[PDB]
Amino acid sequence: LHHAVIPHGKGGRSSVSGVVATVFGATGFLGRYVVNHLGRMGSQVIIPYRCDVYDIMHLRLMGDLGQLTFLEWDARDKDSIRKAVQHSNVVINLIGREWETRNFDFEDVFVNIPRAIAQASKEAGVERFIHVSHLNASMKSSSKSLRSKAVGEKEVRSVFPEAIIIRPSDIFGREDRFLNHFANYGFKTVKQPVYVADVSKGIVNATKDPDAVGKTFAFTGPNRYLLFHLVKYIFGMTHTTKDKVERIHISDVMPTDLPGLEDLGVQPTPLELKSIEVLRRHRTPAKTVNY
Amino acid sequence: LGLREIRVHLCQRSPGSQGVRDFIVQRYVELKKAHPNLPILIRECSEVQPKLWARYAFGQEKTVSLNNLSADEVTRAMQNVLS
Amino acid sequence: RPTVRPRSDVTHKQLSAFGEYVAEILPKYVQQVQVSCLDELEICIHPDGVIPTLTFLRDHTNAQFKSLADLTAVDVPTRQNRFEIVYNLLSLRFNSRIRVKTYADELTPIDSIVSVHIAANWYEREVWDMFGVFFFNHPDLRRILTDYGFEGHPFRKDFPLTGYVELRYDDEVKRVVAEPVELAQEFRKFDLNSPWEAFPAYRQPP
Amino acid sequence: GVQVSPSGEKITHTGQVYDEKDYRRVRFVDRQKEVNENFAIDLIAQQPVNEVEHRIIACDGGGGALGHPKVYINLDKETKTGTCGYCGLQFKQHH
Amino acid sequence: FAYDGLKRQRLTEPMVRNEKGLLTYTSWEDALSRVAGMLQNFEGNAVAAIAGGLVDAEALVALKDLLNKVDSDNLCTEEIFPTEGAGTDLRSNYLLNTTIAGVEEADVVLLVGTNPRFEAPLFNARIRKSWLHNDLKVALIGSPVD
Amino acid sequence: QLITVDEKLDITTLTGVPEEHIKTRKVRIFVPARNNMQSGVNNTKKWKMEFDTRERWENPLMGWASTADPLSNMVLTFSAKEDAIAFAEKNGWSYDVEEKKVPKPKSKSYGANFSWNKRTRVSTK
Amino acid sequence: TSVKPIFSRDLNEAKRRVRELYRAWYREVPNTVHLMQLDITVKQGRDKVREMFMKNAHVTDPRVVDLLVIKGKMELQETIKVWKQRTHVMRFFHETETPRPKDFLSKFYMGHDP
Amino acid sequence: ILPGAAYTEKSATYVNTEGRAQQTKVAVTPPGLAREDWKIIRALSEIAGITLPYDTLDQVRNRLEEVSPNLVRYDDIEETNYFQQASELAKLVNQEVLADPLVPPQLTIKDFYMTDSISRASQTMAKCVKAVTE
Numbered sequence A: 001l002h003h004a005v006i007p008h009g010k011g012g013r014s015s016v017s018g019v020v021a022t023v024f025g026a027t028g029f030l031g032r033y034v035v036n037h038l039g040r041m042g043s044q045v046i047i048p049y050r051c052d053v054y055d056i057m058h059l060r061l062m063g064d065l066g067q068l069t070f071l072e073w074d075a076r077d078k079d080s081i082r083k084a085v086q087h088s089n090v091v092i093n094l095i096g097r098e099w100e101t102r103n104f105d106f107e108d109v110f111v112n113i114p115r116a117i118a119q120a121s122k123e124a125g126v127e128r129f130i131h132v133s134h135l136n137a138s139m140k141s142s143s144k145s146l147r148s149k150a151v152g153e154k155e156v157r158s159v160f161p162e163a164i165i166i167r168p169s170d171i172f173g174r175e176d177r178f179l180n181h182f183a184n185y186g187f188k189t190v191k192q193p194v195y196v197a198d199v200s201k202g203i204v205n206a207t208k209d210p211d212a213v214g215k216t217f218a219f220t221g222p223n224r225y226l227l228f229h230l231v232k233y234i235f236g237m238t239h240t241t242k243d244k245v246e247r248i249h250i251s252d253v254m255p256t257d258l259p260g261l262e263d264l265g266v267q268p269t270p271l272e273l274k275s276i277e278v279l280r281r282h283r284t285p286a287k288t289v290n291y
Numbered sequence B: 001l002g003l004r005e006i007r008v009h010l011c012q013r014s015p016g017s018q019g020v021r022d023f024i025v026q027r028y029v030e031l032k033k034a035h036p037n038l039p040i041l042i043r044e045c046s047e048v049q050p051k052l053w054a055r056y057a058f059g060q061e062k063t064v065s066l067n068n069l070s071a072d073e074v075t076r077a078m079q080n081v082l083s
Numbered sequence C: 001r002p003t004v005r006p007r008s009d010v011t012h013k014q015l016s017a018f019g020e021y022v023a024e025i026l027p028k029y030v031q032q033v034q035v036s037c038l039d040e041l042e043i044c045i046h047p048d049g050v051i052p053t054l055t056f057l058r059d060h061t062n063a064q065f066k067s068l069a070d071l072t073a074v075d076v077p078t079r080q081n082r083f084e085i086v087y088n089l090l091s092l093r094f095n096s097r098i099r100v101k102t103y104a105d106e107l108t109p110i111d112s113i114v115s116v117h118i119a120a121n122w123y124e125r126e127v128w129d130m131f132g133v134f135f136f137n138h139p140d141l142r143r144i145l146t147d148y149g150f151e152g153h154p155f156r157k158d159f160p161l162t163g164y165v166e167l168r169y170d171d172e173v174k175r176v177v178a179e180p181v182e183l184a185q186e187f188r189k190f191d192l193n194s195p196w197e198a199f200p201a202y203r204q205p206p
Numbered sequence D: 001g002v003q004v005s006p007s008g009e010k011i012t013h014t015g016q017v018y019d020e021k022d023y024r025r026v027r028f029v030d031r032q033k034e035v036n037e038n039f040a041i042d043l044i045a046q047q048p049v050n051e052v053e054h055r056i057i058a059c060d061g062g063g064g065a066l067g068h069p070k071v072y073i074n075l076d077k078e079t080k081t082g083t084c085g086y087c088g089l090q091f092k093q094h095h
Numbered sequence E: 001f002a003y004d005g006l007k008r009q010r011l012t013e014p015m016v017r018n019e020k021g022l023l024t025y026t027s028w029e030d031a032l033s034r035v036a037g038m039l040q041n042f043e044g045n046a047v048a049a050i051a052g053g054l055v056d057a058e059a060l061v062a063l064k065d066l067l068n069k070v071d072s073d074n075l076c077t078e079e080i081f082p083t084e085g086a087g088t089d090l091r092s093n094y095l096l097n098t099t100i101a102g103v104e105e106a107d108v109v110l111l112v113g114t115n116p117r118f119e120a121p122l123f124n125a126r127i128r129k130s131w132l133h134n135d136l137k138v139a140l141i142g143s144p145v146d
Numbered sequence F: 001q002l003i004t005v006d007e008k009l010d011i012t013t014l015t016g017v018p019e020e021h022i023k024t025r026k027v028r029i030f031v032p033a034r035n036n037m038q039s040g041v042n043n044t045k046k047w048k049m050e051f052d053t054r055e056r057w058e059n060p061l062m063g064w065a066s067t068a069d070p071l072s073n074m075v076l077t078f079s080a081k082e083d084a085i086a087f088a089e090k091n092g093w094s095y096d097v098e099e100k101k102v103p104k105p106k107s108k109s110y111g112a113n114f115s116w117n118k119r120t121r122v123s124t125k
Numbered sequence G: 001t002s003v004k005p006i007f008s009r010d011l012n013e014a015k016r017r018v019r020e021l022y023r024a025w026y027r028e029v030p031n032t033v034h035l036m037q038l039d040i041t042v043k044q045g046r047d048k049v050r051e052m053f054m055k056n057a058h059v060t061d062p063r064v065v066d067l068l069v070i071k072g073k074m075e076l077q078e079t080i081k082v083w084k085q086r087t088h089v090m091r092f093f094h095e096t097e098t099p100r101p102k103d104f105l106s107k108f109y110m111g112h113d114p
Numbered sequence H: 001i002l003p004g005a006a007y008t009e010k011s012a013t014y015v016n017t018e019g020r021a022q023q024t025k026v027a028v029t030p031p032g033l034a035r036e037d038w039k040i041i042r043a044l045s046e047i048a049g050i051t052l053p054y055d056t057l058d059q060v061r062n063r064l065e066e067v068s069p070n071l072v073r074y075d076d077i078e079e080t081n082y083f084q085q086a087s088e089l090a091k092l093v094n095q096e097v098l099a100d101p102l103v104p105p106q107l108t109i110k111d112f113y114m115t116d117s118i119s120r121a122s123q124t125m126a127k128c129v130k131a132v133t134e
């Protein structure tokens, strides 16, 4: 476009891809692999941090000497988030938590803060506003963690239309909150989870495509396992609040029309294949349903 | 449908390309007078095959080897293409 | 004359006459013994007669050269037998040195000398690592200097300086992974080779 | 004592400031742009001309073993003056 | 001293018209989609290409071969060359048949009203080279020139 | 003992060089030009075999210049053209030769600058 | 052309010397993956191995083949033992770097790569 | 507007008046997103249903061996003949050479320095013009 956004350069790790981006919540599980698939291919990924500088060291690498910068902010401050994205071809919103605090609730975090990032992004001449709500989240779900999130899916479009939205199904990866939960201690609860990179690649793949300019995606993956068959399979392999445990038994869907992965540039990896590496920290084939 | 081209590959001096050189001095002008707006073209490398390409409408082409072919047969070889 | 590293003419003849002593005694597989102005000896031979000259030089009174120092491999990628492989020895008894060099293609293996000089246990092996020049009868050939998954033979003049891989840590797999080579500064090949031969009577006519 | 872009960023000796539409300014966020205010082109015109005698002279940078190899100049130009590429001094002939 | 021109007012990206009507910046796959789709519409002889200037003979053949499969052969160039007889034919009408080295091996020239000095200045050096060293005499037609 | 064979003498498996820098890599064999600034000509007499060039992008942080192909700065000095092709074919690379450009032996007679008849009568001595 | 032979004669004697090596690598996928943990189960490890021997089938020279056995034995001698690590054995796969488009049309949307 | 490269930035093959076809070995890669000219037309084909049988640079050269095989012989001249055929072919033509002074477009030094899309676009040339018109 201008002169130096250009993706002239092969491969990665000293290249360029014009994917100058601002991933917010990339300090825990999900965004670190996002920055990995960005920072490897050559992409000046900003990372706004509001936590310890030591809790972000593992982000210093997977970043090739300038493509990874850092800066301070706080979600309860107008115009700092604006300052963070004055220079942003792209924006990504991974923010979220599985529990309310004295300061922040499910309500404040998934909805009110993306609302300002949404307005903040449009006040600059941005292009893309990749957001991450979660699947199983129309409204009136049995918990509260999800019924708030869908409002953000309503309240973004009234701020920044034509915004990618990924509502994926459950995620598994090393250092997760999902498999490790089960590991460290039931029919009518069935769930097709999704490997992390298979989510991360699409997002990285979604920030360059000509399509995906408002289309709501949902990354699900194969092998719709049954819980009781799966939870014992973990036990077969290895050898807490309301709105989270309430979120466990809610998990039930079927895909109506939604795009998914293979119409984005991804080959989804099943669970059983890359499942040992995460459960290897607890050491000494499950049944599927289509419905 | 139509031919819309003729072209000529030869060697400037060799036994193999002989007859083409005879073909030119002996008939070339009259064919170009019979076929004025027909885009002919004629070229003479050193050690090439004496070949003859000719297009059609959908960029389709054929080849006719004419190694050691005398003038009379080259002309029939040309008119069978202008058949 | 002050600044010319005085020649010391005498030992040229010692190493020249002794240079003849090894030729006529061993005319097989021996071509052009020579000597540089630097009074240091060089003996070019054929690969099929490697050991019997070494063992003359490890085991003979007038050539006690029972101590090996190097075994390199010099590239000349313009001839047939590009790899000049070089030996160089020493007398503790006679107080002098020698050089006994040979040749090979990228595949014309050379029988080893470890029965003669076990000093060459690893000097031989780096050449296998660094040039891909196999040796017969060498115990436990294997890599020395390169990674345990490094293809190639880098001291070859065909292998670029910065090679064909660079490593790093891709956190998604928790490993030190490799992907292709992607610099930031591009080593800048200079044309520091001026005209003006600088060394006449020492040169190549067409 | 430098000149500044309308976006508000500092210009170097050279006109070097990034345009508005440039993601490069990120690196200055919560930092600042290092710059030397001592433009040589401003300092050097703030130096008087040494109006010497004979048309040809030697120059030095304040110490013969300590800068500006001994180049000479032909100071025949009464219109302009003569410079030395090392320094930025200027000279006249006095006549 | 033309290389300075190679970094001055130079194109970078595949641009295309705007719904407003002016030009903008897009991708290759954004643009060529607009082209081959149009190519499939107009075919046969409503189609032509103008080479000229500074072009390969690799693109010319492919560019030819492209319009060769749309029944359109109107491939033209900027400056004219005659065609009323054997124009493109007979490669002795658009060449230096004479070896430019052979210009030394020549006692006479008729320059027709063009400037070697300004069109290919270095056909003029082999003239002036063969004007001084070996004898030579030239006669020119039209446009008195220095 | 010995064995007979007449084959192309491939080596391309013994180097790594996985797939890209084998096939899609032209090679230029030539006698380098005389750097016309200098009248010196020792850079000739040789058969340097440098390879084609590819992307040299600009490192967006420093302004540095960077690359992907390590196989770009790859000079190789040979002594005869007949040996060069044998070396590059031995690794399967699509050589592209340029021949020598010998300069002619020219007659340059000092006195002919000072002719009565002729047209080479120089000025300024 | 009356060359010196090494370790074998015309190819079809060197082709069993090959199989002595596949006779080891085929039985040393399961020993590695367990002793030093990995992700591959056993099979795609064996697919990769044969995918390397079905790269060098184009060879036609005994001397070359008698050489390529050796470098396989080294990596085997490095693999049979623990001298490697989980990063060296799992290095062949090219797991991470995206395979470029083998076609033409996608090959130049990025890269001046003929 | 499909940005193509320039002679410094492609492996092309131009030719001179003599017919001594020659080559442009590449030095730089073009800026931004621009690509090579022929490299496009292969795509403009394949995006449609059309498809040329090319996947490299050499195929394109092998095409030239089929069209007019002078464009591969580097530094050599396709030594030509057969002009009299044109003259016979052309003597039958008959036209009018009107009574004007034939003049070229290049007439002095100031109309030299600016031509054909490159020299136009540089200051270093117009400095000559800016100097020569004074």
Ligand SMILES: NC(=O)C1=CN([C@@H]2O[C@H](COP(=O)(O)OP(=O)(O)OC[C@H]3O[C@@H](n4cnc5c(N)ncnc54)[C@H](OP(=O)(O)O)[C@@H]3O)[C@@H](O)[C@H]2O)C=CC1
Pocket (backbone or CB within 6 Å): A024, A025, A026, A027, A028, A029, A030, A031, A050, A051, A074, A075, A093, A094, A095, A096, A097, A104, A109, A132, A133, A134, A168, A169, A170, A171, A176, A177, A178
């Ligand atoms: N991981 C999972 O199991 C799944 C997650 N998701 C969604 O994916 C996204 C990623 O969450 P994940 O990364 O997995 O879990 P994390 O625990 O890594 O939380 C993600 C980030 O949100 C940041 N954050 C939370 N609240 C605030 C706040 N008030 N102000 C600023 N930053 C804040 C956290 O900062 P800190 O680093 O200080 O915690 C953290 O870095 C969320 O939207 C989540 O709902 C969807 C499906 C499955």
Ligand SMILES: [Zn+2]
Pocket (backbone or CB within 6 Å): D059, D060, D061, D068, D084, D086, D087, D088, D089
């Ligand atoms: Zn000075």
